[PDB]
Amino acid sequence: TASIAQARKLVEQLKMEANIDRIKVSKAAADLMAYCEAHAKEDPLLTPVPASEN
Amino acid sequence: LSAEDKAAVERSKMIEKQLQKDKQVYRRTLRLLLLGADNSGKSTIVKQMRITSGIFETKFQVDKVNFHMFDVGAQRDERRKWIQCFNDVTAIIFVVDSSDYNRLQEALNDFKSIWNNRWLRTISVILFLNKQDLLAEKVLAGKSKIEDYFPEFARYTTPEDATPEPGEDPRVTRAKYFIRKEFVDISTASGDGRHICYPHFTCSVDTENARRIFNDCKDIILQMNLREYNLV
Amino acid sequence: ELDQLRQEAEQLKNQIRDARKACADATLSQITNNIDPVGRIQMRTRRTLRGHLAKIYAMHWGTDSRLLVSASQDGKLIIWDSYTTNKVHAIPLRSSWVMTCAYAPSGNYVACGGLDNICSIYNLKTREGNVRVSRELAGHTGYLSCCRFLDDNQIVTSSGDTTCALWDIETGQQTTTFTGHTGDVMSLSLAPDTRLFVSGACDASAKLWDVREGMCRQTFTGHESDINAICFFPNGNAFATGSDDATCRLFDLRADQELMTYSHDNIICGITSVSFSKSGRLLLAGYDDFNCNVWDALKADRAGVLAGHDNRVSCLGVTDDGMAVATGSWDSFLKIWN
Amino acid sequence: SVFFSVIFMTVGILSNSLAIAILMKAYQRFRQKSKASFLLLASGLVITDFFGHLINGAIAVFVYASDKEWIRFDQSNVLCSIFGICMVFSGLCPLLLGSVMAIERCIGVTKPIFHSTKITSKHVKMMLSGVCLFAVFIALLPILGHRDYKIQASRTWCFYNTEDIKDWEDRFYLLLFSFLGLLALGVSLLCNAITGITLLRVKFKSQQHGRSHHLEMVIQLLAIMCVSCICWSPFLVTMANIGINGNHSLETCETTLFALRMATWNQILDPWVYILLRKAVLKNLYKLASQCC
């Protein structure tokens, strides 16, 4: 009886997963934009650093 | 200049020499891939070439030419992922049980899938129709023939150029040639002219098996040289 | 009674989808439209590494932005010096069909794997000078797809057997085994905190895994085909997944949904590798079209193209400091871009 | 007359440039599949031929543009010796690298497994370097024998002593050059004929379905065998007659200059019949030319 085991395990997994909290996309987008703007000064790929510093 | 830098450059030169020495042997040996369902007698073919491992290795020598034959031992049913790693090989050996007609459809489907693969579209596919004696005995028994599974067999006749071996029954010849025609029409379809199949009839005791491998590999390498000389 | 559980799981999935959509207040584009564009990020090949005898399939950078390890299907692990191009080590692998390699952060051990289903940890600081196999662990029933080091004694590895496991080197046994996806695992990515990591599978789904607790905390199903690449965001809150559908999607853990989909009509080839820059604005994804395109994480616009290859770009990785980018391809050449 | 050498240079320069471009573009691809030995030899041949036509055309333009006053710009016998090496070399490389290539494809078609497993790219590079060294040696052998190249009757090119043949040293050099040229040509022709016969046999004997790249190979082999002979045999036979018959020969310098012109048309047409006249290369070049311009 492995099918019943798989089914109950999937159901319990979905149950324990549905309890995870979630926030609005606006806050996450703002946080990502702020993080990107913060470390923009320490990214040689983004800001071309002088040749002497390569 | 720094002495440590010069020593590192010397170590790099030594590593390059070792890499060249290894590339020599890598280019000397030829790589071959053996594919086939469990029903196929690929295990017998591998064990007869006396001339939780996910991959198995077998090495043999035909006319002084070394060949490396790899066969997956422990992997799942899916193939679209790990098949990409076996590209750039000399050729692929596809084994199918021509006797059992039930699993023949799945074998043809697998052959078509391996042939139309975007990454393996430049590697020739060797076809060995193993277990011909069992197929002959079954089709001579008259109990169940290919017609019960394939409708085209009711209107297919043996070609005019079909050369059967001395002492073969016409029914066996017609059945094997119908199977070969099915395989050839599955292969030529979208063949692209860059890779061709090599149908060959063999059994579980034929010692000429390796000879056919060498013969078709000599031709596969030939085509590779023509495309180079023509800059295709 | 099994249909009852099937319908219960379907209802739970519908409820989760509804709760996830309810939080979709706005898209990332509507917030990133007012920001200035990244502009043409042109890159040039500074160093060209040669010496590989076969296709280059895996590479990884260590803690330092100088040393570099690369894996090829010829059975050779070469430690490249990005600054002087000199080869540091050459390890003859016992298995030629290698598919993954990793460089431990301690700089002393390096792991690799492939179709052999065995993960061999090679010691680089062996007192004898030569590279020796410290531990060769087995137990997986499939080809190893990706490997990553958490410390000098723990390593996580993915296999085609659909299940992942955390290994302890000093003993060589699975400390914790995960439930597994519905398909073969393909890529791994450790979070900067070392406590969480996300893995992608061929079933177009991504699951967030915890190192200590062997359970899945979040699952994503935004892709429409096999996920071949995955990389964590520099902050550990999001990750991008590359798939064969010629589209890259950015998934955020805090938001728990896809925020941006990087795709273009002229691109039909699949993605093989994905990586983020130190700041996160530049998304570098390798495509099967023999070219690597840079995407703006916020604007989703193409900022450049790295077409310095003649074959399938199979692996690429950005240094921890973001000084240079290494792109590996089946053409046996590993070029270090700006 | 200047016009002649100038139109014979610019055409060769353009042909060799296109050939080098196509050969590099093809080697960047085929290198991942096989040794690309044929491509390497073709690139080497085209490169040496190119340098030839910029070194000998430049010298010729400088000497037609100097009213042919050799006594003015050539007193210490330094420039004529350089349009002496640069002449012998160019010639003998373009033929002796045409022979080695035919020998390669001969083995590649008659014994593919042997050319693939036993012959390594290192051996091909070594053979190319050795051919180049032998060519430059035969070009510098007269200088290392107390003799130099004398101004020909045309007063526009320096080569082996043609007029006033007295000692056997000049005869020896002329006969050796002619023998090397004829031997290279014969070896190339024999290899090409063997390859063509093998291809025709193995193809007309086969009836499975294959023939996509055999007819083109036979056509290329026939074109090479025809052009190389028709263009080189005259000059080689002329040099052989001059060396064996001495000054008593009836031929004049006009036929020698014409044969020069024909041999210089084995090295414009070589970058053509080897690479630029292939179907794939032809269509790609035509398409990119129509699209760009």
Next chain:
Amino acid sequence: VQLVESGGGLVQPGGSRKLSCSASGFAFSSFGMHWVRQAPEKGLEWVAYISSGSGTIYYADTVKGRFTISRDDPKNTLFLQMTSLRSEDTAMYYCVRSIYYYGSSPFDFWGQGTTLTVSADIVMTQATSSVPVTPGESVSISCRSSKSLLHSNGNTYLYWFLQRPGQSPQLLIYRSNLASGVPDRFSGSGSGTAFTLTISRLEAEDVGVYYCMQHLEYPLTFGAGTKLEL
């Protein structure tokens, strides 16, 4: 890992002698060998150097022409053929292994050596030769050089060797970067010209002589050596 030397003994002026060294426990070919001489109650002095695979060889300007080094990889053995032996050659020779690459530690293992008795570039000068100290106190050995060892690449080519009574010189620091097998007590600092070896806590195992060496250029030159007593 072991480096056992042989061939020593008494020799007359003008004679010759072949000093051999048996290597084991490591890839002899992968490691470059360095012969270093040590005159009686004096400091060290580099003699010759042979790289991996015999691809590069160097000798000291004082020993050029007389001594010649050779290594047999098949048997993992080293040989040093000496010619025109002078009276000054009285010294104990040591064989040292060294592997060079980013993150390595050249001169990590010193052999037992062999005793042999008869009958313009950068120079390392140490201002201190003896420092009396008792348990509980710290030590800071200073070092001076005539040329800045700070190469353009920024690497500090400074090497410290500690020779204890009866034992061979032990590597302490190869570049601030502490060496392997030595406690964290040892530390290095200073600029490209001036250097300082600072030990936080002095144990009963530091008794010996501390030698300084530069590695910017292949020709090496050891210092006078600072001795610590306790």
